[PDB]
Design a protein around this motif. Structure first.
Motif, PDB file in Angstrom:
ATOM      1  N   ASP A 180      39.842 -16.986  -9.811  1.00  0.00           N
ATOM      2  CA  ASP A 180      39.824 -15.850  -9.035  1.00  0.00           C
ATOM      3  C   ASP A 180      40.231 -14.579 -10.236  1.00  0.00           C
ATOM      4  OD1 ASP A 180      39.314 -16.684  -6.262  1.00  0.00           O
ATOM      5  OD2 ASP A 180      40.589 -14.952  -5.799  1.00  0.00           O
ATOM      6  N   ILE A 181      39.307 -13.603  -9.918  1.00  0.00           N
ATOM      7  CA  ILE A 181      39.105 -12.394 -10.733  1.00  0.00           C
ATOM      8  C   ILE A 181      40.268 -11.686 -10.416  1.00  0.00           C
ATOM      9  CG2 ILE A 181      38.004 -10.476 -11.537  1.00  0.00           C
ATOM     10  CD1 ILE A 181      35.408 -12.030 -11.228  1.00  0.00           C
ATOM     11  N   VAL A 182      41.093 -11.218 -11.246  1.00  0.00           N
ATOM     12  CA  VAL A 182      42.165 -10.127 -10.742  1.00  0.00           C
ATOM     13  C   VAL A 182      41.999  -8.819 -11.099  1.00  0.00           C
ATOM     14  CG1 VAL A 182      44.853  -9.605 -11.176  1.00  0.00           C
ATOM     15  CG2 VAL A 182      43.898 -12.167 -10.769  1.00  0.00           C
ATOM     16  N   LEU A 183      42.438  -7.895 -10.444  1.00  0.00           N
ATOM     17  CA  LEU A 183      42.160  -6.475 -10.758  1.00  0.00           C
ATOM     18  C   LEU A 183      43.365  -5.734 -10.910  1.00  0.00           C
ATOM     19  CD1 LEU A 183      39.299  -6.682 -11.068  1.00  0.00           C
ATOM     20  CD2 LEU A 183      39.010  -5.719  -8.660  1.00  0.00           C
ATOM     21  N   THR A 184      43.931  -5.042 -12.094  1.00  0.00           N
ATOM     22  CA  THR A 184      45.196  -4.678 -12.214  1.00  0.00           C
ATOM     23  C   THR A 184      44.832  -3.109 -12.258  1.00  0.00           C
ATOM     24  OG1 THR A 184      46.293  -6.474 -13.364  1.00  0.00           O
ATOM     25  CG2 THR A 184      47.208  -4.578 -13.616  1.00  0.00           C
ATOM     26  N   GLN A 185      45.365  -2.243 -11.483  1.00  0.00           N
ATOM     27  CA  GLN A 185      45.251  -0.869 -11.528  1.00  0.00           C
ATOM     28  C   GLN A 185      46.444  -0.410 -11.922  1.00  0.00           C
ATOM     29  OE1 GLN A 185      43.112  -0.899  -7.205  1.00  0.00           O
ATOM     30  NE2 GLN A 185      42.625   1.045  -8.103  1.00  0.00           N
ATOM     31  N   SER A 186      46.161   0.866 -12.915  1.00  0.00           N
ATOM     32  CA  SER A 186      47.380   1.549 -13.236  1.00  0.00           C
ATOM     33  C   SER A 186      47.094   3.084 -13.407  1.00  0.00           C
ATOM     34  CB  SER A 186      47.610   0.928 -14.938  1.00  0.00           C
ATOM     35  OG  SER A 186      47.143   1.238 -15.836  1.00  0.00           O
ATOM     36  N   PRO A 187      47.827   3.785 -13.344  1.00  0.00           N
ATOM     37  CA  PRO A 187      49.273   3.434 -12.833  1.00  0.00           C
ATOM     38  C   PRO A 187      49.308   3.256 -11.481  1.00  0.00           C
ATOM     39  CG  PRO A 187      49.208   6.052 -12.922  1.00  0.00           C
ATOM     40  CD  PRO A 187      47.874   5.350 -13.533  1.00  0.00           C
ATOM     41  N   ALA A 188      50.598   2.694 -10.850  1.00  0.00           N
ATOM     42  CA  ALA A 188      50.413   2.572  -9.305  1.00  0.00           C
ATOM     43  C   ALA A 188      50.261   3.823  -8.685  1.00  0.00           C
ATOM     44  CB  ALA A 188      51.637   1.762  -9.214  1.00  0.00           C
ATOM     45  N   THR A 189      51.011   4.866  -9.166  1.00  0.00           N
ATOM     46  CA  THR A 189      51.140   5.975  -8.537  1.00  0.00           C
ATOM     47  C   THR A 189      50.628   6.984  -9.705  1.00  0.00           C
ATOM     48  OG1 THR A 189      53.033   5.408  -7.220  1.00  0.00           O
ATOM     49  CG2 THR A 189      52.498   7.810  -7.277  1.00  0.00           C
ATOM     50  N   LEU A 190      50.386   8.208  -9.202  1.00  0.00           N
ATOM     51  CA  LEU A 190      49.850   9.260 -10.311  1.00  0.00           C
ATOM     52  C   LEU A 190      49.857  10.638  -9.341  1.00  0.00           C
ATOM     53  CD1 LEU A 190      46.455   9.152 -12.395  1.00  0.00           C
ATOM     54  CD2 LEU A 190      48.107  11.143 -12.130  1.00  0.00           C
ATOM     55  N   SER A 191      50.656  11.558 -10.000  1.00  0.00           N
ATOM     56  CA  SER A 191      51.126  12.690  -9.420  1.00  0.00           C
ATOM     57  C   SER A 191      50.319  13.740 -10.011  1.00  0.00           C
ATOM     58  CB  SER A 191      52.665  13.024  -9.326  1.00  0.00           C
ATOM     59  OG  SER A 191      53.300  11.978  -8.750  1.00  0.00           O
ATOM     60  N   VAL A 192      49.867  14.687  -9.445  1.00  0.00           N
ATOM     61  CA  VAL A 192      49.003  15.599 -10.273  1.00  0.00           C
ATOM     62  C   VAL A 192      49.196  16.935  -9.331  1.00  0.00           C
ATOM     63  CG1 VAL A 192      46.825  14.980  -9.412  1.00  0.00           C
ATOM     64  CG2 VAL A 192      47.283  16.085 -11.735  1.00  0.00           C
ATOM     65  N   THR A 193      48.763  18.122  -9.921  1.00  0.00           N
ATOM     66  CA  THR A 193      48.568  19.326  -9.427  1.00  0.00           C
ATOM     67  C   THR A 193      47.041  19.602  -9.125  1.00  0.00           C
ATOM     68  OG1 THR A 193      50.552  20.229 -10.418  1.00  0.00           O
ATOM     69  CG2 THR A 193      49.310  21.751  -9.468  1.00  0.00           C
ATOM     70  N   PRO A 194      46.634  20.306  -8.065  1.00  0.00           N
ATOM     71  CA  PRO A 194      45.336  20.572  -8.076  1.00  0.00           C
ATOM     72  C   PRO A 194      44.602  21.213  -9.089  1.00  0.00           C
ATOM     73  CG  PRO A 194      46.164  20.625  -5.703  1.00  0.00           C
ATOM     74  CD  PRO A 194      47.188  20.558  -6.763  1.00  0.00           C
ATOM     75  N   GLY A 195      43.558  20.802  -9.669  1.00  0.00           N
ATOM     76  CA  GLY A 195      43.085  21.643 -10.896  1.00  0.00           C
ATOM     77  C   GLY A 195      43.561  20.637 -12.137  1.00  0.00           C
ATOM     78  N   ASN A 196      44.144  19.650 -12.211  1.00  0.00           N
ATOM     79  CA  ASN A 196      44.436  18.999 -13.391  1.00  0.00           C
ATOM     80  C   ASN A 196      43.450  17.714 -13.121  1.00  0.00           C
ATOM     81  OD1 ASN A 196      46.632  19.867 -14.949  1.00  0.00           O
ATOM     82  ND2 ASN A 196      48.138  19.351 -13.214  1.00  0.00           N
ATOM     83  N   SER A 197      42.983  17.067 -14.493  1.00  0.00           N
ATOM     84  CA  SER A 197      42.119  16.188 -14.309  1.00  0.00           C
ATOM     85  C   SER A 197      42.895  14.683 -14.471  1.00  0.00           C
ATOM     86  CB  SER A 197      41.098  16.208 -15.460  1.00  0.00           C
ATOM     87  OG  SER A 197      40.112  17.293 -15.297  1.00  0.00           O
ATOM     88  N   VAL A 198      42.323  13.642 -13.811  1.00  0.00           N
ATOM     89  CA  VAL A 198      43.044  12.245 -13.949  1.00  0.00           C
ATOM     90  C   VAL A 198      42.089  11.414 -14.368  1.00  0.00           C
ATOM     91  CG1 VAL A 198      44.927  13.116 -12.303  1.00  0.00           C
ATOM     92  CG2 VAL A 198      42.548  11.692 -11.496  1.00  0.00           C
TER      93      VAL A 198
END
Lengths: 107, 114, 129
Positions: free
Chosen positions: A1-19
């Motif tokens: 079974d293919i596993v998908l690990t996403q990171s980071p779990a959370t990502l805080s940012v201010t509108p305007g910033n790029s992620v």
């Protein structure tokens, strides 16, 4: 079974910033990676199909890239309403599988 | 134009079948593959399975014979029949076409004690 | 465009056909081989009015839609001419949907008759993946 690990779990940012969101497959899945947006009290929305293919109607500030085992979703100039859950999904092998998700939120 | 409407009992008891309906508008169910996806608490999504545009079905091995996806080609809607659920099966069930373009509002179907 | 074995094999890996839903790259090169002989401009008009298009001879009655096929389901949401592109993206994108439709690669006769239950990996053999 293919596993998908996403990171980071959370990502805080201010509108305007790029992620830059990450999604790694526990096994090369070519370009069979898809991105979904998930706002509270709402249903998943298809953002990017097949690693980088754009979806008619999705804002230009969204974009995906990657291949094989590593994929990235890029949100330039995040906006007040881009905040929510972000899930990636592989359609490479059955059963299709989803990432753990990255929660994008205001700083 | 296209709309996926979910309906069904949002609370079922242990040992009995979990059944859900996904009414599709603006698009005949035989002109697209359709699936059922459920979100578990903690943002844990699971692809339950799907029905192809030609009637072939695929079920996530995680379910094991407990799942049955059927469809009403007349009223244009399909269903989810999940046998003998348990606290485990408690989650929000979604229905979206195979391509990911359309989704149902999302209906939380919990399975607490009683 | 007439692809070459290894070239197309790479292009297909490029597009995620490598081990897609249990199908090793070999199957896809072989399927293309016998369906169109690696010719992306390959089209086969049927007596039934429909036409098979491209490297994987996708049919205009079910997957793509040209402007001359009554009842075309157009399940791949693409004009069939897009399957005649030198760029295989449209054909592959369609093939993936077709191979997920429930019949596996059996959706292609050519593949069934010349590739099914055969040493398919030989088609990617001698290539730079």
């Amino acid at each position: 079974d293919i596993v998908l690990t996403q990171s980071p779990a959370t990502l805080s940012v201010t509108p305007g910033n790029s992620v830059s969101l990450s999604c790694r497959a526990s096994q090369s899945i070519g370009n069979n990676l898809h991105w979904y947006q998930q706002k509270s009290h709402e249903s998943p929305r298809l953002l990017i199909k097949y690693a980088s293919q754009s979806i008619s109607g999705i804002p230009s500030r969204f974009s995906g890239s990657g291949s094989g085992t590593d994929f990235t979703l890029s949100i330039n100039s995040v906006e007040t309403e881009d905040f929510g859950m972000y899930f990636c999904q592989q359609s490479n092998s059955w059963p299709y599988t989803f990432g753990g998700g990255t929660k994008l939120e205001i700083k | 134009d296209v709309q996926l409407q979910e309906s069904g009992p949002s609370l079922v008891k242990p040992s009995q079948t979990l059944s859900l309906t996904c009414s599709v508008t603006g698009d005949s169910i035989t002109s697209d593959a359709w699936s059922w996806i459920r979100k578990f608490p903690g943002n844990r999504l699971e692809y339950m399975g799907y029905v192809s545009a030609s009637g072939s079905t695929y079920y996530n091995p995680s379910l094991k014979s407990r799942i049955s996806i059927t469809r009403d080609t007349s009223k244009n809607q399909y269903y989810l029949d999940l046998n003998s659920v348990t606290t485990e099966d408690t989650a929000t069930y979604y229905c979206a076409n195979w391509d990911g373009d359309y989704w149902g509002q999302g209906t939380l179907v919990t399975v607490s004690a009683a | 465009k007439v692809f070459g074995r290894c070239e197309l094999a790479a292009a297909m890996k490029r597009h995620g056909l490598d081990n897609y839903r249990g199908y090793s790259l070999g199957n896809w090169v072989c399927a293309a081989k016998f369906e169109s002989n690696f010719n992306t401009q390959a089209t086969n008009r049927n007596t039934d009015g429909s036409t098979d298009y491209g490297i994987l001879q996708i049919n205009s009655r079910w997957w793509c839609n040209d402007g001359r096929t009554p009842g075309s389901r157009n399940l791949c949401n693409i004009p069939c001419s897009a399957l005649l592109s030198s760029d295989i993206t449209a054909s592959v994108n369609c093939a993936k949907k077709i191979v997920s439709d429930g019949n596996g690669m059996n959706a292609w006769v050519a593949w069934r008759n010349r590739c099914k239950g055969t040493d398919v990996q030989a088609w990617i053999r001698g290539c730079r993946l």
